[PDB]
Write an enzyme that holds these catalytic residues in place. Structure first.
Site, PDB file in Angstrom:
ATOM      1  N   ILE A   1     -33.934  33.097  14.377  1.00 29.68           N
ATOM      2  CA  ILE A   1     -34.716  32.570  13.267  1.00 29.68           C
ATOM      3  C   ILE A   1     -33.939  31.464  12.543  1.00 29.68           C
TER       4      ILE A   1
ATOM      5  N   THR B   1     -25.731  34.890  11.950  1.00 27.78           N
ATOM      6  CA  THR B   1     -26.941  34.333  12.537  1.00 27.78           C
ATOM      7  C   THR B   1     -28.134  35.290  12.340  1.00 27.78           C
ATOM      8  N   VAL B   2     -29.293  34.734  11.982  1.00 27.30           N
ATOM      9  CA  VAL B   2     -30.481  35.530  11.672  1.00 27.30           C
ATOM     10  C   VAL B   2     -31.437  35.641  12.856  1.00 27.30           C
TER      11      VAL B   2
ATOM     12  N   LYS C   1     -29.094  39.974  10.331  1.00 32.42           N
ATOM     13  CA  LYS C   1     -28.028  38.979  10.277  1.00 32.42           C
ATOM     14  C   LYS C   1     -26.813  39.515  11.018  1.00 32.42           C
TER      15      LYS C   1
ATOM     16  N   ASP D   1     -25.356  32.423  -4.965  1.00 33.64           N
ATOM     17  CA  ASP D   1     -26.015  31.548  -3.997  1.00 33.64           C
ATOM     18  C   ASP D   1     -27.547  31.567  -4.097  1.00 33.64           C
TER      19      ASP D   1
END
Lengths: 178, 227, 227
Positions: A11, A13-14, A26, A103
């Site tokens: 997607i 790392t997703v 993730k 964030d």
């Protein structure tokens, strides 16, 4: 009628995944992982993306609820105020539990079923007020796509109030026939 | 015959065929009887929906007239439409008003207020399309009928009887909209709203649900008004 | 009275959603100009499509009630007969216009395809009204129309472009509703979708939206028809 854990797709790392249904996955490093999990265990609220668990093998992984729809960033680039209220609703939860996000931006706000809110240079003013600044950039994204006068005022305060005050602020902000 | 016209109207409504429903309720109205509560709702719905289509048509084309730029003939398309639409609407309004006045008013007791309310609803729509000064004479005789209605407002039935709710709501719009007096209008809107909100009660299970809708409309007007 | 104004003047009746007025407006364009290019032809299409759309929904509901209810209800037949005769007359109007201007003018593959498809669907709406005696002629005329359209479109419009696709889906409906043959339905629909998937790299800019929407409607129908 008539007319006329299973890791799948990357997607971003997703990955999109399968674990009792759809789930987002993730997948110095250990520490960054330990801390995230540690923080996630302390969250339980509709406006915080639901942590479901973690994996250490075959790789390190965080698992959460899958949100169908997309990020606010993706969408943008009464409903708007509601996105703002929810976004403030979860940030409050976070701070009350002495958590600073650090964030907050429209990319990390996921718009589940295009209704429910689920929680980089432009959003950076760390403290509770730094997230408040970020959130004000979100209001700017919400209202410029790039509006009550009270909402411009609230933007300019956050751009500083804490989330209870912000929340209080946003919350305060012919005939049918048989 | 006349009950079969009730069926014909119910059929036409289920058919989504409002213009023929108006012809049916007009031909019902010729009898001159006091319409029973369903029979009365049918009379209301048929004309209510028929006019709404022409109103939104009128709103778009009038908005387009303001928005239009350049050579006359394009604006003249919109003029020709406004004349066409406003005359279409005028004849519809006068068609219902003539029936309402002749049949309904002489034999009208909450019926009296219902019919007076209708009279001013159709006049309000005439006031929307009106230009020049005859606009005043229409809103005046409309406000006269609403005074006659509001003079009955606590004679016959309760402070939350359903027809009283609509009677109060629409009169507040007379003052706000083109009599252009929103603070005056707020006083009627919040006094009617808070009387019903304080009453917090009404005659029947049907009326409780219905009343619960209407107060929201009044809140949305009051909160819009004087923003 | 000029196509120069009526390009807007029909959009006015459409933006007011008074499609009956839009239909008379577009008829005047058509007999005047003898052409509509690829946007302004939508005006003609959408006007007549919505005029029949309302009637078809009403007819569907009314005829359903007639079968649902129980002799007293015989009134439903009167009104159905009114709706059917309206929809007949509207389709006779469309047929007479389409044949007289819209068949002989045709001077591109797009025009030939588009009007021939159009003819078939306007017969398909008559087929919903038709009892068996009328129905045989109606379906033959529609089958001629979709075939003639199909043959041209099959050579001329590559499935990269949209009109062929809507033609294919409606041609598939025509079998499935009227003459139910799920093999014929899949034969048209699935082959056309497989061709369009083979064209899928090379859709035009409007086709990226429109042809993908039509392909989605193909999947939707295919799902219902394989059931």
């Amino acid at each position: 009628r008539s007319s006329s854990i299973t890791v799948g797709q990357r997607i971003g790392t997703v990955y999109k995944g399968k674990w009792h249904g759809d789930v987002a996955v993730k997948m110095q490093q250990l520490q960054a992982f330990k801390n995230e999990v540690g923080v996630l265990r302390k969250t339980r609220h509709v406006n915080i993306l639901l942590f479901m668990g973690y994996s250490t093998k075959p790789q390190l992984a965080i698992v959460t609820q899958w949100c169908e729809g997309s990020s606010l960033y993706h969408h943008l680039h009464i409903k708007l105020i509601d996105i703002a209220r929810q976004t403030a609703q979860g940030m409050d939860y976070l701070h009350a539990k002495s958590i600073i996000h650090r964030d907050l931006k429209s990319n990390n706000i996921f718009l589940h079923e295009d209704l429910t809110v689920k929680i980089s240079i432009l959003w950076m003013a760390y403290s509770f007020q730094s997230d408040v600044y970020a959130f004000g950039i979100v209001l700017y994204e919400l209202m410029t796509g790039q509006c009550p006068k009270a909402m411009k005022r609230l933007m300019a305060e956050c751009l500083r109030p804490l989330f209870p005050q912000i929340l209080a602020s946003i919350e305060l902000l012919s005939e049918p026939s048989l | 015959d006349k009950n079969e016209l009730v069926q014909k109207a119910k059929l036409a409504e289920q058919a989504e065929r409002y213009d023929d429903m108006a012809a049916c309720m007009k031909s019902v109205t010729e009898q001159g009887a006091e319409l029973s509560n369903e029979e009365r709702n049918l009379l209301s719905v048929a004309y209510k929906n028929v006019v709404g289509a022409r109103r939104s048509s009128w709103r778009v084309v009038s908005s387009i007239e303001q928005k239009t730029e350049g050579a006359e003939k394009k604006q003249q398309m919109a003029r020709e439409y406004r004349e066409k639409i406003e005359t279409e609407l005028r004849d519809i309004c006068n068609d219902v008003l003539s029936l309402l006045e002749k049949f309904l008013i002489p034999n009208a007791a909450e019926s009296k207020v219902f019919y007076l309310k209708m009279k001013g609803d159709y006049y309000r729509y005439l006031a929307e399309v009106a230009a020049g000064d005859d606009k005043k004479g229409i809103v005046d005789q409309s406000q006269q009928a609403y005074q006659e209605a509001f003079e009955i407002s606590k004679k016959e039935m309760q402070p939350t009887h359903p027809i009283r709710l609509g009677l109060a709501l629409n009169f507040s719009v007379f003052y706000y909209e083109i009599l252009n007096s929103p603070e005056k209008a707020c006083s009627l809107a919040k006094t009617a709203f808070d009387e019903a909100i304080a009453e917090l009660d009404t005659l029947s299970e049907e009326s409780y649900k219905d009343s619960t809708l209407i107060m929201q409309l009044l809140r949305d007007n009051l909160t819009l008004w004087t923003s």
